[PDB]
Design an enzyme around this catalytic site. Structure first.
Site, PDB file in Angstrom:
ATOM      1  N   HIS A 129      37.321  36.430  36.104  1.00  0.00           N
ATOM      2  CA  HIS A 129      38.176  35.983  34.926  1.00  0.00           C
ATOM      3  C   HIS A 129      38.004  34.191  35.049  1.00  0.00           C
ATOM      4  CE1 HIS A 129      38.997  39.483  32.861  1.00  0.00           C
ATOM      5  NE2 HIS A 129      40.350  39.037  32.448  1.00  0.00           N
TER       6      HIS A 129
ATOM      7  N   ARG B 266      38.580  40.572  39.911  1.00  0.00           N
ATOM      8  CA  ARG B 266      39.093  40.285  38.666  1.00  0.00           C
ATOM      9  C   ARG B 266      39.334  39.094  38.456  1.00  0.00           C
ATOM     10  NH1 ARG B 266      43.527  42.193  35.603  1.00  0.00           N
ATOM     11  NH2 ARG B 266      43.972  40.755  33.992  1.00  0.00           N
TER      12      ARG B 266
ATOM     13  N   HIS C 272      34.762  48.408  37.365  1.00  0.00           N
ATOM     14  CA  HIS C 272      35.793  49.305  36.904  1.00  0.00           C
ATOM     15  C   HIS C 272      36.184  50.176  37.738  1.00  0.00           C
ATOM     16  CE1 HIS C 272      36.112  47.196  32.624  1.00  0.00           C
ATOM     17  NE2 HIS C 272      36.539  46.151  33.483  1.00  0.00           N
TER      18      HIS C 272
ATOM     19  N   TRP D 252      40.215  54.116  36.202  1.00  0.00           N
ATOM     20  CA  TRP D 252      39.137  54.571  35.729  1.00  0.00           C
ATOM     21  C   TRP D 252      38.613  55.647  36.659  1.00  0.00           C
ATOM     22  CZ3 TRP D 252      40.303  49.258  35.833  1.00  0.00           C
ATOM     23  CH2 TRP D 252      40.014  48.492  34.826  1.00  0.00           C
TER      24      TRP D 252
HETATM   25  C1  ZNH Z   1      33.410  44.130  28.596  1.00  0.00           C
HETATM   26  C2  ZNH Z   1      34.248  43.510  29.423  1.00  0.00           C
HETATM   27  C3  ZNH Z   1      35.384  43.587  30.227  1.00  0.00           C
HETATM   28  C4  ZNH Z   1      36.530  43.915  29.806  1.00  0.00           C
HETATM   29  C5  ZNH Z   1      36.837  44.043  28.337  1.00  0.00           C
HETATM   30  C6  ZNH Z   1      37.440  44.063  30.769  1.00  0.00           C
HETATM   31  C7  ZNH Z   1      38.631  44.293  30.922  1.00  0.00           C
HETATM   32  C8  ZNH Z   1      39.627  44.495  31.624  1.00  0.00           C
HETATM   33  C9  ZNH Z   1      40.771  44.819  31.429  1.00  0.00           C
HETATM   34  C10 ZNH Z   1      41.548  45.317  30.111  1.00  0.00           C
HETATM   35  C11 ZNH Z   1      41.586  45.203  32.918  1.00  0.00           C
HETATM   36  C12 ZNH Z   1      43.069  45.590  33.089  1.00  0.00           C
HETATM   37  C13 ZNH Z   1      43.920  44.200  33.289  1.00  0.00           C
HETATM   38  C14 ZNH Z   1      45.392  44.956  33.690  1.00  0.00           C
HETATM   39  O1  ZNH Z   1      45.624  44.597  34.655  1.00  0.00           O
HETATM   40  O2  ZNH Z   1      45.830  45.674  33.172  1.00  0.00           O
HETATM   41  C15 ZNH Z   1      40.473  44.713  33.797  1.00  0.00           C
HETATM   42  C16 ZNH Z   1      40.315  44.721  35.165  1.00  0.00           C
HETATM   43  C17 ZNH Z   1      39.454  44.834  36.035  1.00  0.00           C
HETATM   44  N1  ZNH Z   1      38.265  44.307  35.826  1.00  0.00           N
HETATM   45 ZN1  ZNH Z   1      37.326  44.658  33.982  1.00  0.00          ZN
HETATM   46  N2  ZNH Z   1      36.786  43.871  32.262  1.00  0.00           N
HETATM   47  C18 ZNH Z   1      35.434  43.417  31.599  1.00  0.00           C
HETATM   48  C19 ZNH Z   1      34.635  43.058  32.446  1.00  0.00           C
HETATM   49  C20 ZNH Z   1      34.573  43.129  33.903  1.00  0.00           C
HETATM   50  C21 ZNH Z   1      33.508  42.597  35.018  1.00  0.00           C
HETATM   51  C22 ZNH Z   1      32.269  42.009  34.390  1.00  0.00           C
HETATM   52  C23 ZNH Z   1      34.334  42.805  36.209  1.00  0.00           C
HETATM   53  C24 ZNH Z   1      33.790  42.427  37.512  1.00  0.00           C
HETATM   54  C25 ZNH Z   1      32.578  42.174  38.009  1.00  0.00           C
HETATM   55  C26 ZNH Z   1      35.615  43.527  35.835  1.00  0.00           C
HETATM   56  C27 ZNH Z   1      36.404  43.662  37.029  1.00  0.00           C
HETATM   57  C28 ZNH Z   1      37.695  44.239  36.863  1.00  0.00           C
HETATM   58  C29 ZNH Z   1      38.467  44.532  38.005  1.00  0.00           C
HETATM   59  C30 ZNH Z   1      38.067  44.929  39.194  1.00  0.00           C
HETATM   60  C31 ZNH Z   1      39.642  45.080  37.389  1.00  0.00           C
HETATM   61  C32 ZNH Z   1      41.116  45.660  38.155  1.00  0.00           C
HETATM   62  C33 ZNH Z   1      42.381  44.990  38.462  1.00  0.00           C
HETATM   63  C34 ZNH Z   1      43.234  45.824  39.346  1.00  0.00           C
HETATM   64  O3  ZNH Z   1      43.069  46.806  39.336  1.00  0.00           O
HETATM   65  O4  ZNH Z   1      43.854  44.804  39.961  1.00  0.00           O
HETATM   66  N3  ZNH Z   1      35.665  43.467  34.502  1.00  0.00           N
HETATM   67  N4  ZNH Z   1      39.316  44.597  33.044  1.00  0.00           N
END
Ligand code: ZNH
Ligand code: HEC
Lengths: 294, 108
Positions: A52, A48, A175, A191
């Site tokens: 990001h 993540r 996810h 999830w």
């Molecule tokens: C359409 C578009 C989109 C959206 C709205 C989102 C949204 C989101 C949210 C609301 C959260 C929660 C935060 C907290 O701490 O509470 C997350 C987490 C998240 N995410 Zn995911 N993503 C996305 C894409 C994505 C991609 C493309 C990848 C890679 C390759 C991812 C991987 C992720 C992970 C592995 C996690 C887990 C973190 C922890 O548990 O530590 N993701 N993300």
């Protein structure tokens, strides 16, 4: 009158086996600090982090991306949608004191690669040379996506990262890892059930569960199931849209296809904007702890 | 053992409602959405002849015996990650004790 062409340059005389050790280091700390977030582990938050800091990119003007490692600079760190990642930083910093030579960007990206492989995911190839850039080229906030929207938004938001149908459905399958926290982004619930192991679960839950739309304790609407699982309106959009659904149906039936598509897509999401040298090294496919006898 | 042994009769109506829609118990019975559960205890996971499993149910490689099944039926998708057994789990330990006592006498 050009966008910024980011030339990649290797860290003064280092090869495969050195980065292999950086992989092995952050994989050992991954293994040991298993207590985090009610036993999920620091794995799902590193991916993540690797996303990001690559999802800041824009194709029209090469600003953002994973090059300069601009997460360390205050502007980005305190972005509303970036909340929670601080833990992933706290985790990574004792390794930045063990390896001061390594670039900020090269570490966040490798952070997410070493997370997926260790969680038994695809062997995601990786390239180095994400040289650190100044704080003035720290990208203004809001460049990550908003979850409350639908299908057409996810198609047109990801069009900026240069990813297609097949490519965004593949990236969405990450996810299967971890969960959504109400403290950070204002959504709650996992999830799936196997949060700390990367599988094609995200797709098998997406269509084999009976989903009903509800409102949470942050006054946001999200799709929940009675098994305790959950989906974002953007995660549930993957099956609402007819074209997206054919790819969700494919990856659910063939996990090896998802793996191959996720590797190609995740590496490309990580490499966005960086122009690689032409005397530069061929990508490294690091070996995991399981394979290396530790 | 660790697991005790509930009433085999309360365990029949549990299967009839929560498992019969995807699994079959009798000898040589037909594979549905899930395998033919005959001779499941003592047998390694992912080994009912003629069923195309996931490589998750195969590489897990466990020997099915009363205790590890309770650790599976509680939350299946956590025990075997990537499995195509679409099922949340039985949370009450008494209902897990009833069902397994039925299954060890049925799949003999
Ligand atoms: C359409 C578009 C989109 C959206 C709205 C989102 C949204 C989101 C949210 C609301 C959260 C929660 C935060 C907290 O701490 O509470 C997350 C987490 C998240 N995410 Zn995911 N993503 C996305 C894409 C994505 C991609 C493309 C990848 C890679 C390759 C991812 C991987 C992720 C992970 C592995 C996690 C887990 C973190 C922890 O548990 O530590 N993701 N993300
Ligand atoms: C339908 C959906 C269901 C339901 C309601 C249950 N199971 Fe079963 N199950 C199903 C499938 C599709 C598979 C194959 C999983 C894979 O290939 O990854 C399984 C598998 C099992 C097994 C393992 C078989 C083996 O060891 O070779 C067992 C022990 C098993 N399932 C048991 C079980 C019980 C007792 C259930 C009733 C409460 C139950 N499942 C429900 C599909 C489905």
């Amino acid at each position: 009158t050009t966008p910024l062409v980011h030339v990649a340059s290797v860290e003064k005389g280092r090869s495969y086996e050195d980065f292999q050790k950086v992989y092995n280091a952050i994989a050992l700390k991954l293994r040991e600090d298993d207590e985090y977030d009610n036993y999920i582990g620091y794995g799902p938050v590193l991916v993540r982090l690797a996303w990001h800091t690559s999802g800041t990119w824009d194709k029209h003007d090469n600003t953002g991306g994973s090059y300069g490692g601009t997460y360390r600079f205050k502007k980005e760190f305190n972005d509303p949608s970036n909340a929670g990642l601080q833990n992933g930083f706290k985790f990574l910093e004792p390794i930045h004191k063990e390896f001061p030579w390594i670039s900020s960007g090269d570490l966040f990206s490798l952070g997410g690669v070493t997370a997926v492989q260790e969680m038994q995911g695809p062997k995601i190839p990786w390239r180095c040379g994400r040289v650190d850039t100044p704080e003035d080229t720290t990208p203004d906030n809001g460049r990550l996506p908003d979850a409350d929207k639908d299908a057409d938004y996810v198609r047109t938001f990801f069009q900026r990262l240069n990813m297609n149908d097949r490519e965004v459905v593949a990236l969405m399958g990450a996810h299967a890892l971890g969960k959504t926290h109400l403290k950070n982004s204002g959504y709650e619930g996992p999830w799936g059930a196997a949060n700390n192991v990367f599988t094609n679960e995200f797709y098998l839950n997406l269509l084999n569960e009976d989903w009903k739309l509800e409102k949470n304790d942050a006054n946001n609407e999200q799709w929940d199931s009675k098994s305790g699982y959950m989906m974002l309106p953007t995660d549930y959009s993957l099956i609402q849209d007819p074209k997206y659904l054919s790819i969700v149906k494919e990856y659910a039936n063939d996990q090896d296809k998802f793996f191959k598509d996720f590797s190609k897509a995740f590496e490309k999401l990580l490499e966005n904007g960086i122009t690689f040298p032409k005397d530069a090294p061929s990508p490294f496919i690091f070996k995991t702890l399981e394979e290396q006898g530790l | 053992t660790e697991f005790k042994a509930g009433s085999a009769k309360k365990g029949a109506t549990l299967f009839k409602t929560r498992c019969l829609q995807c699994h079959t118990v009798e000898k040589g019975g037909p594979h549905k959405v899930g395998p033919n559960l005959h001779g499941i205890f003592g047998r390694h996971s992912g080994q009912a002849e003629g069923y195309s499993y996931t490589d998750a149910n195969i590489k897990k490689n466990v020997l099915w015996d009363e205790n590890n099944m309770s650790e599976y039926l509680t939350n299946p998708k956590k025990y075997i990650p990537g499995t195509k057994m679409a099922y949340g789990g039985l949370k009450k330990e008494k209902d897990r004790n009833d069902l397994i006592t039925y299954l060890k006498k049925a799949c003999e």
